[PDB]
Design a protein around this ligand. Structure first.
Ligand SMILES: [Mg+2]
Ligand SMILES: [Mg+2]
Ligand SMILES: [Mg+2]
Ligand SMILES: [Mg+2]
Ligand SMILES: [Mg+2]
Ligand SMILES: [Mg+2]
Ligand SMILES: [Mg+2]
Ligand SMILES: [Mg+2]
Ligand SMILES: [Mg+2]
Ligand SMILES: [Mg+2]
Ligand SMILES: [Mg+2]
Ligand SMILES: [Mg+2]
Ligand SMILES: [Mg+2]
Ligand SMILES: [Mg+2]
Ligand SMILES: [Mg+2]
Ligand SMILES: [Mg+2]
Ligand SMILES: [Mg+2]
Ligand SMILES: [Mg+2]
Ligand SMILES: [Mg+2]
Ligand SMILES: [Mg+2]
Ligand SMILES: [Mg+2]
Ligand SMILES: [Mg+2]
Ligand SMILES: [Mg+2]
Lengths: 151, 180, 62, 205
RNA sequence: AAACUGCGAAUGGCUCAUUAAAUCAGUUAUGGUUCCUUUGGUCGCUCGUACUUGGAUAACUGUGGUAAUUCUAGAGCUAAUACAUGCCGACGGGCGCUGACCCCCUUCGCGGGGGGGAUGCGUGCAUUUAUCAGUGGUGACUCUAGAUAACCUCGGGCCGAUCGCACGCCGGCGGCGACGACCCAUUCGAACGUCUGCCCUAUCAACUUUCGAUGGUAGUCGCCGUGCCUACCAUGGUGACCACGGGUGACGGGGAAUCAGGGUUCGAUUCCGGAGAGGGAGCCUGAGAAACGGCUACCACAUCCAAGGAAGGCAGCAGGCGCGCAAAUU
């Protein structure tokens, strides 16, 4: 309920729910065991994943992807896409002739697991690289740090 | 029985095609009337169909049954087959041999002659003949099978024996560290 | 009005003299009966066995 | 032929690119293999590396796991009930991965009644045949009757499943993609998903 | 000699038309894949005619056709490491489920417990699926290995119907090699991704999305990751940090010329990468081509003809014509 939006049934592919039991254990509770994995670089997998009820296959924690590659950081600008955000990375490109930098930026589309929330435009997000998720989406959000003005 | 085509333009007849005249066909390997230059290549060619008309250059005829009178060309003289059987079983067939008869004895020989050169008798090398060589190769490769089995047995026994000497020392380390 | 019949034609292997053995020799060896062939086989087999134990004695001699 | 390449496409911004090279072998797409229920028909394709892809045009049997009681039997496929992707695909009865399908209850009910010695999906009319009564009522030895009796505590079935047997048809879903694989194989729908999909197909009316 | 078979012809050689985040360079990834070969691993782990199996075809013999070709028909033969077909052997079993019956302990007996067991059914690696448990390995697997239930493609998977050289041993045994082979691993790679980097232009300021634009969910296709493609949803994505569009006498690099320091200009050209074989498109074969010294069309060109038809591809080497200020020996 409320977890199943879509036409197809929404599962957690590696977990078998329908394991049968006594009618004494059916009255106790239904808690389908989460599959969550510890992602490797020392990001503690958020509390909101391991307890949480949502299902997203492309999330790094609760789903099937592996984080390997570059690890980048950026700031959140535009989130109107479902389970993805657009972050911008700024930097200084050095022009040799003039001996100075010019500003530049690049926009990355990057996927965001529904465990993180309250992720608010203009805050720092550290992402890590995944295998291609979509046409423009090659990355994945590993940890979210708030903007400098949080209360 | 009707067999071969040729037409005034020289094309063959391919038994499948149901037309009269030309048909352009894509021929692949295994088809009639094309032999491929390179592996797995197809050609488009011109093929005259399988229906017989006054249009044909030439018509090839097989003779299925001989009725009465003997024709000058096709009947009176009989031409032998050169090259009797090269395979063991084909020979056992020609001469009706039990498995226990020597094939070596019965093989047809070619009576080869030329003017100025000594008269020869040729014989083809028999293939699929049981023989000391063939029989040997068999027990050879079986012997290799014995070898492999032996090797897996000895290796298994060995690594099993080695695993225990690691295991009792892993038990010693764990137990001593724990009791401490 | 229609044709319901599919003709079944037969293939026959005739006989021809093979160069070096004329049809008389082919038929001479073919029509040879079991007594004749069994005699020839056992005789050649025993001649070969004798030559072979002779060559085993000729292996141990050298 | 059909190119599944990425370079016929707009950029992230959407400016069309002019293709630098003409189409390459390895980017090839093949035609769709739609798979229908009928007597078995299968076409081998040779693919990259020279390996055989087994393609399924008509299928009949598929084998399925009844996961609760952990068995798998080789069953006959009947019909395509539901497909998340396309309604058109239900209509022509096409077998794809994750479409949902009706199977013969039969070999399951047989296994079950052999394991637990209990009635399954039988009418309340209770009418029986000799083989049935000799398998179900049977005869026991002391150690035997204790075994079977010990399992009788375990075997009870979700009312939904129970009903399915009574109808002769089970609801199942296909995990293997016959298109490339060559077999349509899968698992019986049990519990929550089963109730869910039941809700979708009652909703289809 | 020939011919069948096997392998190679995907390299190399040439040119620079296209191509402006494309190619390409450094950087990384494949935990998201394919890999002829080479090197090592495996190759009696499966419990169910073999001292040898079936048919055909080429060279060859002959009869032929057509103006014409590296065209080919019909009739005879005959091979295999070509095609197919298909066993003994180990092999006695072991292990799983089944379990007629039997024993023992215990019990007043029912019962409770420990066993033992004829009978069938399953029995390996690959394949596809589901479930269980948690030997070895990572920064991290839905990894590797294990156990359970089944599955297994007639357009079929593994298990050698093969070859040589030495000849020896107690009618039996065997030494060295050659090919093969499913599958690991390896090598050469290949293919897609990551981060950053390109010349001129505003007399191009908004662009993309009914025909995929951006993302979601399930699939199809593919060697796999992916709007690659379909179905259904969402309304996104890019842009003065110059998108989008146009231009380039634009293949990108390594480099070259010139230079105090800083630059400017050039890089078709011998190394590395990319593209292309008159223009487009589409496939066979294969480990590997969307191949052009393979093929099939259409367009443009052009050769032969007995007028029916046939054959083409120098941006390989030479050489010839044309173009041109401009470039070598059949
Ligand atoms: Mg392979
Ligand atoms: Mg050849
Ligand atoms: Mg080679
Ligand atoms: Mg090897
Ligand atoms: Mg000839
Ligand atoms: Mg012939
Ligand atoms: Mg999708
Ligand atoms: Mg997908
Ligand atoms: Mg669509
Ligand atoms: Mg140019
Ligand atoms: Mg340049
Ligand atoms: Mg250059
Ligand atoms: Mg030059
Ligand atoms: Mg080059
Ligand atoms: Mg090319
Ligand atoms: Mg030219
Ligand atoms: Mg090859
Ligand atoms: Mg081409
Ligand atoms: Mg050429
Ligand atoms: Mg070439
Ligand atoms: Mg030239
Ligand atoms: Mg001049
Ligand atoms: Mg000059």
């Amino acid at each position: 309920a409320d977890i199943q939006t879509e036409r197809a049934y929404q599962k957690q592919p590696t977990i078998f729910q329908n394991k049968k039991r006594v009618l004494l254990g059916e009255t106790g509770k239904e808690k389908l065991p989460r599959y969550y994995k510890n992602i490797g670089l020392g990001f503690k997998t958020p509390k909101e994943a391991i307890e949480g009820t949502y299902i997203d296959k492309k999330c790094p924690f609760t789903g099937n992807v592996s984080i390997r590659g570059r690890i980048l950081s950026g700031v959140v600008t535009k989130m109107k896409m479902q389970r993805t955000i657009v972050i911008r990375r700024d930097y200084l490109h050095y022009i040799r002739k003039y001996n100075r930098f010019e500003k530049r930026h690049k926009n990355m589309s990057v996927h965001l697991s529904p465990c993180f929330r309250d992720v608010q435009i203009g805050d720092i997000v550290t992402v890590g690289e995944c295998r291609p998720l979509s046409k423009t989406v090659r990355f994945n959000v590993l940890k979210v740090t708030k903007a400098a003005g949080t209360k | 029985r009707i067999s071969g085509g040729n037409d005034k333009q020289g094309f063959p007849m391919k038994q499948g095609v149901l037309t009269h005249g030309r048909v352009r066909l894509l021929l692949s390997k295994g088809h009639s009337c094309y032999r491929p230059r390179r592996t797995g290549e197809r050609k488009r060619k011109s093929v005259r169909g399988c229906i017989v008309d006054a249009n044909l250059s030439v018509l090839n005829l097989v003779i299925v049954k001989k009725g009465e009178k003997d024709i000058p060309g096709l009947t009176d003289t009989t031409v032998p087959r050169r090259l009797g059987p090269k395979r063991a079983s084909r020979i056992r067939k020609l001469f009706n041999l039990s498995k226990e008869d020597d094939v070596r004895q019965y093989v047809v020989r070619k009576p080869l002659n030329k003017e100025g050169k000594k008269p020869r008798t040729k014989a083809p090398k028999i293939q699929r003949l049981v023989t000391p060589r063939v029989l040997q190769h068999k027990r050879r490769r079986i012997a290799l099978k014995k070898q492999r089995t032996k090797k897996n047995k000895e290796e298994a026994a060995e690594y099993a024996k080695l695993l225990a000497k690691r295991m009792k020392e892993a038990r010693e380390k764990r137990q001593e560290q724990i009791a401490k | 009005x229609x044709x319901x019949x599919x003709x079944x034609x037969x293939x026959x292997x005739x006989q021809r003299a093979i160069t070096g053995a004329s049809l008389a020799d082919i038929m001479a060896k073919r029509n040879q009966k079991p007594e004749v062939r069994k005699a020839q086989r056992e005789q050649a087999i025993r001649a070969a066995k004798e030559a072979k134990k002779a060559k085993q004695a000729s292996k141990k001699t050298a | 032929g059909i190119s599944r390449d990425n370079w016929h496409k707009r950029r992230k911004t959407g400016g069309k690119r002019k293709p630098y090279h003409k189409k390459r072998k390895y980017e090839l797409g093949r035609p769709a293999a739609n798979t229908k229920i009928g007597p078995r028909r299968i076409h081998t394709v040779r693919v990259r590396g020279g390996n055989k892809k087994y393609r399924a045009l008509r299928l009949d049997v598929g084998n399925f796991s009844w996961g609760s009681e952990c068995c798998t039997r080789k069953t006959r496929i009947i019909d395509v009930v539901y497909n998340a992707s396309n309604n058109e695909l239900v209509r022509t009865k096409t077998l794809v991965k994750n479409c949902i399908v009706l199977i013969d209850s039969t070999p399951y009910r047989q296994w079950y009644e052999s394991h637990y010695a209990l009635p399954l999906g039988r009418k309340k009319g209770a009418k029986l045949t000799p083989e049935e009564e000799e398998i179900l009522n049977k005869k026991r030895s002391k150690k035997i009757q204790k075994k079977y009796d010990e399992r009788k505590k375990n075997a009870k079935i979700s009312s939904l499943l129970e009903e399915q047997f009574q109808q002769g048809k089970l609801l199942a879903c296909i995990a293997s993609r016959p298109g490339q694989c060559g077999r349509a194989d899968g698992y019986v729908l049990e519990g929550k998903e089963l109730e869910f999909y039941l809700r979708k197909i009652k909703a289809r009316k």
